[PDB]
Assembly symmetry: D4
Homo-oligomer: 150 residues x 8
C-alpha cells in the first residue's frame, strides 16, 4: 500500500458506490489503473468486501445493549465462552478486554422481549458465566465503524 491506496480507501470507506471516473478524477490517475489498484487491494485482503449500510431503526431495532460478561477461570472456559457469545443471534460485537479482564458484547434487538428470549435467557443459562452486566443504550451519539481512515 502507498499514499494513493490510502486516498482510494478513504473514499471507498464512505461511499463504495462512486463511479470510477469520479474517483479517478478526484485522485488524478488513469481509471484503468485505479481499477487495478482496487482489485489488488481486494486480493491482498485490505478490502474484505462491500456492504450495504442499513438503518437499524428501519428494522425496528430499538433495544440496543452493551453487556460485560465475566467468565469463570480454569480449563478453557474463557475461550469457550467467547465463541458461545459470538453465535447468539443479535450479537454483532464480542471483544475480550483488559482492565475488567472480561468480554464486551454488542447486540441489537427489536424489543425487550426479544432481548430476553434471544440474549439474556441464553446468557443466564451458561454455567461458565461468573457475572454479566447489561447496559441499555439510550442514545447512539455515533456509530461509524466503517470509518477507519480519519
Amino acid at each position: 500500500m502507498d499514499e494513493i491506496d490510502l486516498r482510494i480507501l478513504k473514499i471507498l470507506q464512505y461511499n463504495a458506490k462512486y463511479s470510477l471516473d469520479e474517483i479517478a478524477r478526484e485522485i488524478r490517475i488513469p481509471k484503468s489503473t485505479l481499477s487495478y489498484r482496487i482489485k489488488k487491494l481486494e486480493k491482498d485482503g485490505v478490502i474484505k468486501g462491500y456492504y450495504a449500510y442499513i438503518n437499524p431503526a428501519s428494522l425496528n431495532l430499538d433495544y440496543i445493549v452493551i453487556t460485560s460478561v465475566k467468565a469463570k477461570y480454569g480449563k478453557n472456559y474463557h475461550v469457550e465462552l467467547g465463541n458461545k457469545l459470538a453465535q447468539i443471534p443479535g450479537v454483532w460485537g464480542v471483544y475480550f478486554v483488559l482492565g475488567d479482564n472480561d468480554f464486551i458484547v454488542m447486540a441489537r434487538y427489536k424489543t425487550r422481549e426479544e432481548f430476553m428470549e434471544k440474549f439474556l435467557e441464553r446468557v443466564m443459562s451458561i454455567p461458565e458465566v461468573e457475572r454479566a452486566s447489561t447496559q441499555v443504550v439510550v442514545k447512539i451519539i455515533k456509530e461509524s465503524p466503517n470509518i477507519v481512515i480519519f
Copy 2:
C-alpha cells in the same frame, strides 16, 4: 417494507457487490423490479449507503480501546461531552447507556503513542469528565456491525 425487501437486505448486508441477476435469481423476481425495490429502499432511508469493509490490521490499527466516560452533572455537560467525544479522531462509536449512566466510546489507533496523543490526552483535558476508564481490547472475537438481519 415486505418479506421480499428483507430477503434483498439480508443479501446486501453481506455482499453489496452481487450481480442483480444472481440476486434476482436467488429471490425469484424480475431483475427490473429488484432494481426498483433497491432504489426505493435507498430513498426511503432503509439503505443509507454502501461501504467498503477495510481490514483494520491492513491499516496497522493495533491499539483498540473501549472507554467508559462519566460526565459531571449539571447545566448541559452530559450532551456537550458526548459530542466532544464523537469528534475525536479514531473514535467510531459513542453511546450513552443506562446502568453506569455514562458514555461507552469505541476507538482504534495504530499504537499506544497515537492513542495517548489523539485520544487520552484530549479526554484528560476535558473538565466535564468526572472519570474515564479505558479497556484495552486484546482479542476481537467478532465485529460484524453490518449484519442487522440474522
Copy 3:
C-alpha cells in the same frame, strides 16, 4: 380506552370512594354511562381491583428494606430464585433489572428481629444466591405506586 376513560381512571387511582354523581359531574357524562365505562374497564382488565391504602406505621412496620440479590448462573437458577424471593412473607416487590443484572427486593417488617428471622435468614440459606446487599430505608420521601396517571 378513550380520553374519557383516562379522566375516570385519573380519579379512581386517587380516590375510589367517590360518588358516581360527583364523578359524573366532574367529567360531564350520564352517571349511567360512567357506571358502564367503569364496569367495562374492570372486565377488560384495566382496573384490576380496589384496595384500601393502609398506613404501614399503623402496623408498626418500622424496618423497611430494599435488597439487591445476585443469582448464580446456569440451569434455571435465576428464575427459581426470583419466585422464592417473591414468596417470602413481608416481600411486596421483586424486580429483575439490567445494569447489576440482578433482583431488587422490597420488603417491610416491624423490627430488625422480624427482618432477620423472616427475610435475611431465609435468603442466606438459598444456595443459588451469589450475593445479597440490603439497604435500610431511613426515609420514605414518596411512595404512591397507585398513581399511574400524572
Copy 4:
C-alpha cells in the same frame, strides 16, 4: 386496633369492594359494628384511603426504571435533592437508604423517549447530583405494595 381490626384490614387490603354482609359474615360480627370499626380506622388514620388498582400495561407503561441517586454533601443538598426527585412526573417512589447512603427512585414511563425527556434529562441537569445509576426493570416478578398484612 385489636385482632378484629387486623382481620378487617387483611380483607380490605386485597379487595375493598367487598360487601359489608360478606365481610361481617367472614369475621362474624354485627354488620353495623363492622361499619363503625371501618369508619374509626379511617379517622384514626389507619385506612388512609381507597384506590383503584390500574394495570400499568393498560397504560402502555413499558419502560420501568429503578434509579440510585447520590447527592453532593454540604448545606442542605440531600434534603433538597430528595424533594426534587419526588416531583418528577412518573416517579412514584423515593427512598433514602443506608449502605449506599443515597436515594432509590422508582419510576414508570411508556417508552425510552418519555423516560429520557421527563426523567433523565431532568436528573442530569440537577447540580446537587453526584452520580445516578438507572437499572432498567425487565421483569416484575411481584408488585403488591397494598399487601401490608401477610
Copy 5:
C-alpha cells in the same frame, strides 16, 4: 432504672475507681443508697462488670486491623463463619452488618508477622469465606467504647 441510675452510670462508665462519698456527694444521695442502687444495677444486668483500661501501645499492639469478610451463601455457612472469626486470638470485635451484608472484624496484633500467622493465614484457610478485605488502621482518632452515655 431512673434518672438517678443514669447519673451514677454516667460516672462509672468513666471512672469506676471513684469513692462512694465523692459519688454520693456529686449526685446528692445517701452513700448507703448509692451502694444499693449500684448493687441492683449489677444484678439486673445493667452493669456487667468492671474492667481495667489497658493502653494497647503498652502491649506493643502496633498492627491494628479492621477486616470485612463475606461468607458464601447456603446451609448455615454465615452463622458458622461468624463464630469462627470470633474465636481467633486478637479479634475483639465481630459484627454482621447490612449494606455489604457481611462481617466487620476488629483485631489487634503487635506486628505484621503476628497478624499474618494468627489472623490472615487462619482466615484464608476458611472455605466458607468468599472474600476478605483488611484495612490497616494507621490512626486511632477515638476509641472509647466504654462511653455509652453522652
Copy 6:
C-alpha cells in the same frame, strides 16, 4: 513490665473488681507487692483507668452503625474531618485506615430517628465529606475491646 505484670493485667482486663488476696493468691506474690506493681502500672500509663461495663441494651441502644467516610483531598480537610466525626454524640470509635483510605466510624443510638438527627444529618452537612456509607449492625457476634491479652 515483666511476666508478672502481664499475669496481673490478664486478670484486671477481665475483672477489676477482684480482691487483692484472690489475685495475690492466683499469681503467688505478696499482696503488698501486687498493690505496688498495680500502682506502678497506673503511673507508667499501662493502666489508664477502670471502667464499668454497661450493657448497651440496658440503655436501649438498638441502632448500631459502622460508617465509612471519605474526605475530600487538599488543605487539611482529612485531619479536620476526623476530629469533627469524633465529637459527634454517640460516636465511640473513629479510625483512619488504608485500603479505602478513609475513616471508619463506630456509633450507637437508641433508634433510627436519633441516629438521623444526631449522626446522619450532621455528617451530611459536612462539606469536606466526599462520600459516606453506613452499615447497620444487625448482630454483635463479639465486642470485648477490653481484652488486650489473649
Copy 7:
C-alpha cells in the same frame, strides 16, 4: 552498619562502577578500609549483588502490565497461587497486599501477543484464580527500585 556504611551504600545504589579512589575520596577514608567495609556488607547480606541496569526499550519490552489477582479461599490456594504467578516468564514482581487482599503482579512483554501467550492464557487456566484485572502501563513516570536510600 554505621553512618559510614550508609554513605557507601548511597553511592553503590546509584553507580556500582565507581573507583575505590573516587569513593574513598568522597567519603574520606582509607581506600583499604572502604574495601573491607564493602566486603563486610556483602557477607552480612546487606549488598546481595551487583546488576547491570538494562533499558527495557532496548529489548523491545513495550507491553508493560500490572495485574491484580484474587485467589479462591481454602486449603492452601493463596500460597500456591503466589508461587505459580512468580514462575511465569516475564513476571518480575509479585506482592500479596492488604486492602484488596490479593496479589499485585508486575510483568513485561515485547507485545500484546507475547503477553497473551505467556501471561494471560497461563493465568486464565489457573483454577485457584477467582478474578484477575490487568492494567496496561502506558507511561512509566519513574522506575528506580535500586534507590533504597533517599
Copy 8:
C-alpha cells in the same frame, strides 16, 4: 544487538561482578571483543548503568506500600500529579495505567509513622488528587526488576 549481546546481557543482569575471563569462557569469544561489545552496549544506551542490590530489610524498610492515585480531570492536572508523586521521598515507582486510568505508586518506608509523614500526609494535601487507595504489602513473593531477559 545480536544473539551474542543477549547472552552477555543475560549474565550482566544477574551478576555484573563476573570476571571477563569467566564470561568470555561461557560465551566463547575473545575477552578483548567481549569488552568492546560491553562498552558498545553502554554507549548505545542498552546498559544504562551498574547498581548494587541492597536488601531493603537491611535498611529496616518494613512498611512497603502500593498506592493507586486518581487525578482530577482538566487543565494539566494528570501530568502534574504524576511528577509530584515521583519526587516524594521513598517512592521508587510511578506508572500511569489504563483500566483504572490512574497512577500506581510503589514506595518503601521503615515504619508506619515515616509512611504517614513522608508519603500519606503529602499525598492528602495535593488538591489534584481525586482519590488514593493504599495497599499494604505484607509479603514480597518476588521482586527482581533487574531480570529483563528470561
